[PDB]
Write an enzyme that holds these catalytic residues in place. Structure first.
Site, PDB file in Angstrom:
ATOM      1  CG  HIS A  40     -11.575 -52.399  -3.129  1.00 45.91           C
ATOM      2  ND1 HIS A  40     -11.820 -53.671  -2.661  1.00 45.91           N
ATOM      3  CD2 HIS A  40     -10.232 -52.230  -3.074  1.00 45.91           C
ATOM      4  CE1 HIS A  40     -10.676 -54.245  -2.333  1.00 45.91           C
ATOM      5  NE2 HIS A  40      -9.698 -53.392  -2.574  1.00 45.91           N
ATOM      6  NE  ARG A  59     -12.970 -36.083   0.305  1.00 45.96           N
ATOM      7  CZ  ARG A  59     -11.770 -36.642   0.428  1.00 45.96           C
ATOM      8  NH1 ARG A  59     -11.102 -36.539   1.570  1.00 45.96           N
ATOM      9  NH2 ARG A  59     -11.232 -37.293  -0.592  1.00 45.96           N
ATOM     10  CD  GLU A  64      -6.758 -33.364   3.691  1.00 48.49           C
ATOM     11  OE1 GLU A  64      -5.663 -33.478   3.105  1.00 48.49           O
ATOM     12  OE2 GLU A  64      -7.850 -33.278   3.088  1.00 48.49           O
ATOM     13  CG  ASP A 105      -5.873 -37.454   4.547  1.00 49.47           C
ATOM     14  OD1 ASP A 105      -5.538 -38.291   3.681  1.00 49.47           O
ATOM     15  OD2 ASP A 105      -7.046 -37.051   4.689  1.00 49.47           O
ATOM     16  NE  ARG A 139      -8.175 -44.687   1.946  1.00 49.97           N
ATOM     17  CZ  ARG A 139      -7.740 -45.924   1.727  1.00 49.97           C
ATOM     18  NH1 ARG A 139      -6.509 -46.268   2.088  1.00 49.97           N
ATOM     19  NH2 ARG A 139      -8.534 -46.817   1.150  1.00 49.97           N
ATOM     20  NE  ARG A 197      -6.129 -35.862  -2.950  1.00 44.95           N
ATOM     21  CZ  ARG A 197      -7.219 -36.235  -3.620  1.00 44.95           C
ATOM     22  NH1 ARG A 197      -7.197 -36.335  -4.941  1.00 44.95           N
ATOM     23  NH2 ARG A 197      -8.333 -36.531  -2.962  1.00 44.95           N
TER      24      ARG A 197
END
Lengths: 919, 259, 260
Positions: free
Chosen positions: A166, A424, A534, A571, A609, A741
């Site tokens: 989180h 990752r 992405e 992304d 996400r 990002r």
């Protein structure tokens, strides 16, 4: 000190959304008691100040007039440092309480089938969606599948939910239990025929628990952040999955299947990114990965020890079959309770399993033998299945199908590590390692080689039998981190891990590079390699990349007809806007499935996400049903965003409904796909995507003053310098916004209630489509009501607009942006207003979220606390950034300059808590 | 510190035409020697503790003794700590011998000759600084000479193997890699190839290499050598050596097996 | 601190016409009770530590929390963690005394009295009150203090019971062995006269080489166990078939002469 806060809430939502709607009653009960505690502890004046803040902000929602916000900001900035933290934290705690009441109301709302109108739209809200047996009945009778077809579809289903940290809140286990006691006191208080004295005592308990939450509060370790991510597994999910699997049994009975789901069916699994995702995150070292793996095995061992001990108490039987009696004699408290003797041994070995992990964690070495512990899932289950068979052989299957069947389903769901860890890393970090190898060996620079030359060389190495990586290799810090990570993977048991994910994957060489590194670093059971596509171009070429990989003999031998691919919404939306990302994602999915079908490969998609799948509550049900036909087929992975994990798993019933949602939607899609898009729809999506990308890039990329506006209208710079993401906000110290990002991109714009990354592009596309042909407007609304993909996409935008407020955004503007750029800000706000109303006319709504009054009510009741923190934030930024802005220091009411940093963190935490998932 | 006399052993190291001497046998005799050395040192140190009851010491020793049974006997305090670390050194070896693993940390024990020597040379310097060199040149000198003679393993282990067993391993590698038969090559071609591999920077030994019992014993011995402390060993002796490639082959195998 | 309700047990204490229920049975059920209590308290304390995350405390608690030095900004957890440690020791000591009869676990490292168990808990309570958190104190912590004052360190107190003629048998063995005559033959008045001159006197009575039947040894042994165990393990000594004051006075003399 006197009046209640419910008058202000009724102004926001006049009227109940259901008969059993008690959300405003609950919000008043909790907050009124909180404010009384506030006054008892800190005096009346600050209590009235805090409530006046809430009243001003509540008035604003009804009458969108900024000046009353400025009034409030003047008062807020004048507070002494101690009072500022106290008022900010108070508003935060009230928002928490309101969210708890929202949870209680969702969990206990009576399902009312009169709300259903039939069709796919019903699946977009928990008030109307189908439970698992309703879904089973539909598949049998409406779609026409046989019970045995449905039963075997379930036997082959697997939904993988992936926990990710989180960004702003910890979720300590002790806080999750304070939450539960507040929720329990709330439901028990409002029980039917409750005694005066029971109610008196429950009231005192509730006041006590609220105070305890109010009186409790450096970034955490990645180890600690993982321990806190596992809290929801201890509190609801561990007990929750056996309860849901038992419901699936009940549903199967009610369509004619006279056997339970076999206990070895992994209908739901759980994975984690915490300690495995190191993409642009150098604090996630090899040692951190080794640690969270061993920590998970301790947590599993202790959860199992508890289950086993409860089971020992129950299984006092003396009748057993021969295989169990012989084994119980061999382990030789009383010998006439053989099930207790077996399970006592299992507990012994689980204790050793735990201690061995503890020793490996501390010293790196364990003198507790792997023989005296459980090394594989199989040897754990052998004694448990022996107990199950023995009970069945003696006619006690009914007993076996109780707690022992729960445990077996827990073993097959959680294993010996609770969660499987995803790894990752960014593709260019692998390129760096391979270039280091090729230059050191003197055969050139792998980085300078074309994609085709890279594949040619990688394949000759992968097909050859001579090793490649010299232990002598000169190593940077980053190259040593990559190699060191692979070395950890080689040393740990293969069941600790899931896939190795390649961020920013663009071409097959990215995948086969990792396959070569895995082998040359000694990973003898290699991890499946998953490319994360992405950018829009990478999604467009993904079916070609997957076809090239599937056409390579070596790779087909490696993957054995199974391939996982990850797709990211936040992304891709950052690259070209949400509408264009949504449509390319659809096409990429259907063409990748086509490639997979031709080559005999079972393709599983992993949903990152910011997606429609992974929204909180009902919307995920419809989102899964809306995915392109034949792209799921019983196998899907979805990330559980930290922003929604509390609403999804914080409460028993919410946990149940979440597990049921994913299970039902996944099952139905495989046997009942959505309608295929008709050519008119595809052409329109194609044309609108061009316009939306163009206008997104017109603001984001090609306007020179965008970054200067962004750094002023948002709290980004402060978010980075305070390391609120526990992660660098950018990859290069410069670059455009293309180097930033996704998490910071979405975070900064939702703090200001503006949400530009979610909607920019949509307005231009809608108006372009309508204006170029009179017919297009009717075909757009036809799409909204007949095409689940389009419906789901647009519903996401509607939810975000309900969470947005241009007035608040303009408030950030007027105080934080230079005169020269203020007209640019109002240009953007003009784009906001035009997108929203165009969004409303398609779908045929006069008001935002008119199709979901339950969601509308829940969102609206949070904003008084959110908006208060908004004005507190905007004025706190101006003080932080401008030494010349003057404030009137008001007398008390019982880094950066004093208090300002604490205040700003509190506003960031609170606004994020209220906004949850956006884009 | 002059090692006028040293002692080595072939027992557990020589495997020339002797299949009973496995990699495990070599690992075992190395740890056994370390236990024997720790035991002999523990006895010598305890006898020395009895004798060195002095209270006069230099400042380096006084400080080290205040850190870390009666404090008026500083030489006994230092030597008592050495004995503690020696007992740990022995127990760690005993655990690795039986279990293959030991939670007794290498830090709590003696891992090198120099960290064993540090406290003993401190005692010697302290006694000399107080005009007690005559006492230093008795039992403490004998112990120091023992440390420099025997080390932490009493003896250093020679390894021996026949050259054709190494040729067998390299021929398995070259045929499996499809570059030909190292056995059929002339001496000059063997040297040429070996030198290009030794000078090269790319590893050679594939982890998938098909191994006979004999080839596995050779590779396994090298893997044991790579895992044990360097001071446990002396030379690697090639029985029936006839040409430089015999020596160069062992150099290649040592490196590709991770020594 | 009001003991509105308390709990007692006869199980292992009542030996009226029950020759099993030996002295060691009594010693056993006493230590078993203390183990059970320690287990129940350890669970209550651990749940309480989870709850009491607060950082604001008074001076007395802050000082003692500092002296005990998992995180130090969680003072109530520091104190209760120490209490749990001493409860674990109390249990293990009892387990050792039960198995071997002997324990290397010091009584100092454990709780021996209800007063020293209460001291850190009341410190927590007063600290919470001093910081305006009496409402939090009156929840789980108040429940725990009420449990301590209800159950103590042994859950229940054990009643001892034995028939009056068994005590007469012991005293008649004492008086005949000393040559004073037969206590059994004496009238009630003569018995009271003799017992009172012994209880008022200051010279001991029970010879260590007294010839004992199995029954007499069981009475004397039982009293010897009572002398060896903590007083708060017991309630009253009940005399079955009591007929006269000499029955009560005889138990008072035996109790003293056996070292209680």
């Amino acid at each position: 000190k006197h009046h209640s806060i419910d008058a202000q809430l009724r102004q926001l939502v006049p009227g109940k959304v259901s008969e059993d709607d008690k959300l405003i009653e609950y919000d008043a009960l909790l907050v009124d008691r909180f404010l009384n505690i506030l006054q008892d502890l800190h005096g009346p004046s600050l209590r009235e100040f805090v409530q006046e803040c809430y009243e001003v902000s509540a008035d604003y929602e009804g009458k969108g007039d900024t000046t009353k916000l400025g009034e409030l900001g003047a008062k807020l900035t004048g507070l002494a440092p101690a009072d500022a933290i106290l008022v900010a934290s108070s508003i935060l705690h009230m928002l928490n309480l309101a969210n708890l009441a929202e949870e209680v109301q969702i969990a206990h709302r009576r399902r009312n089938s009169k709300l259903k109108k039939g069709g796919f739209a019903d699946e977009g809200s928990a008030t109307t969606e189908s439970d698992i047996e309703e879904t089973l009945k539909r598949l049998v009778s409406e779609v026409g599948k046989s019970p045995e077809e449905v039963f075997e579809a379930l036997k082959n289903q697997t939904v993988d939910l992936v926990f990710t940290a989180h960004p702003t809140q910890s979720a300590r286990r002790s806080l999750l239990q304070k939450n539960a006691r507040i929720r329990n006191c709330l439901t028990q208080l409002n029980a039917k025929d409750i005694t005066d004295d029971d109610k008196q005592e429950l009231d005192e308990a509730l006041q006590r628990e609220i105070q305890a939450a109010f009186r409790t509060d450096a970034q955490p370790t990645p180890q600690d952040e993982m321990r806190y991510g596992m809290s929801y597994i201890h509190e609801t999910v561990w007990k929750g999955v056996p309860k849901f699997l038992r419901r699936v049994d009940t549903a199967l009975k009610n369509i004619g299947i006279n056997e339970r789901l076999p206990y070895n069916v992994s209908l739901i699994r759980f994975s984690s990114w915490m300690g495995g995702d190191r993409d642009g995150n150098p604090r996630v070292t090899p040692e951190v990965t080794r640690d969270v793996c061993l920590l998970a095995r301790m947590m599993a061992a202790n959860l199992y020890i508890d289950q086993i001990e409860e089971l020992m108490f129950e299984l006092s039987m003396w009748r057993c079959n021969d295989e169990l009696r012989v084994r119980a004699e061999e382990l030789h408290i009383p010998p006439n309770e053989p099930y207790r003797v077996i399970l006592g041994h299992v507990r012994d070995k689980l204790y050793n399993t735990r201690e061995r992990a503890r020793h490996l964690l501390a010293s790196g070495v364990s003198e507790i033998s792997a023989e005296s512990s459980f090394t594989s899932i199989e040897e754990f289950l052998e004694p448990l299945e022996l107990c199950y068979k023995s009970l069945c052989d003696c006619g006690d299957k009914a007993i076996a199908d109780g707690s022992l069947l729960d445990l077996l389903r827990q073993v097959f769901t959680f294993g010996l590590s609770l969660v499987k860890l995803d790894i990752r890393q960014e593709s260019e970090r692998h390129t760096d390692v391979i270039d280091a190898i090729t230059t050191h060996l003197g055969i050139g620079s792998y980085r300078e080689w074309s994609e085709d030359k890279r594949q040619e060389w990688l394949l000759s190495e992968l097909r050859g039998k001579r090793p490649l990586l010299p232990p002598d290799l000169p190593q940077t810090e980053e190259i040593a981190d990559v190699i060191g990570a692979f070395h950890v993977l080689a040393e740990l048991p293969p069941d600790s891990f899931g896939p190795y994910i390649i961020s920013m994957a663009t071409a097959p060489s990215d995948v086969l590079a990792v396959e070569l590194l895995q082998r040359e670093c000694g990973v003898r059971q290699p991890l499946p390699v998953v490319p994360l596509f992405e950018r829009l171009a990478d999604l467009q070429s993904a079916p070609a990349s997957v076809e090239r990989l599937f056409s390579v003999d070596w790779y087909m031998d490696r993957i054995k007809g199974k391939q996982q691919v990850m797709v990211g919404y936040s992304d891709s939306g950052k690259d070209a806007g949400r509408l264009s990302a949504a449509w390319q994602l659809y096409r990429a999915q259907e063409e990748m499935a086509q490639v997979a079908k031709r080559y005999g490969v079972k393709l599983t998609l992993f949903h990152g996400r910011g997606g429609t799948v992974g929204r909180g509550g009902g919307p995920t049900h419809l989102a899964i049903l809306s995915q392109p036909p034949d792209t799921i087929n019983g196998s899907i992975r979805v990330t559980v965003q930290g922003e929604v994990i509390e609403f999804c798993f914080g409460e028993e019933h919410l946990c149940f409904q979440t597990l049921q949602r994913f299970t039902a939607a996944t099952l139905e899609h495989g046997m009942h796909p959505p309608v295929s898009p008709k050519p008119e729809w595809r052409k329109l999506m194609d044309e609108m995507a061009v316009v939306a990308t163009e206008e997104y890039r017109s603001v984001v990329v090609k306007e020179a003053r965008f970054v200067e506006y962004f750094r002023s209208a948002t709290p980004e710079t402060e978010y980075g310098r305070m390391n609120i993401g526990s992660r660098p906000a950018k990859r290069r110290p410069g670059g455009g916004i293309t180097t930033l990002r996704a998490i910071p991109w979405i975070f900064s714009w939702t703090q200001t209630r503006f949400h530009l990354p979610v909607w920019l592009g949509v307005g231009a596309a809608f108006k372009f489509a309508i204006d170029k042909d009179v017919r297009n407007f009717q075909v757009l609304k036809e799409m909204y009501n007949e095409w689940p993909f389009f419906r789901v996409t647009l519903d996401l935008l509607e939810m975000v607009f309900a969470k947005g407020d241009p007035g608040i955004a303009g408030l950030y503007d007027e105080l934080l942006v230079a005169e020269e750029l203020k007209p640019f800000g109002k240009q953007l706000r003009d784009k906001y207003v035009e997108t929203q109303q165009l969004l409303l006319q398609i779908a045929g709504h006069k008001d935002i979220l008119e199709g979901d009054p339950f969601l509308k009510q829940g969102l609206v009741l949070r904003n008084p606390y959110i908006t208060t923190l908004n004005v507190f934030q905007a004025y706190t930024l101006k003080r932080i950034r401008d030494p010349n802005f003057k404030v009137t220091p008001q007398p008390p009411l019982s880094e950066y300059p004093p208090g300002l940093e604490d205040t700003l963190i509190l506003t960031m935490k609170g606004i994020a808590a209220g906004m949850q998932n956006t884009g």
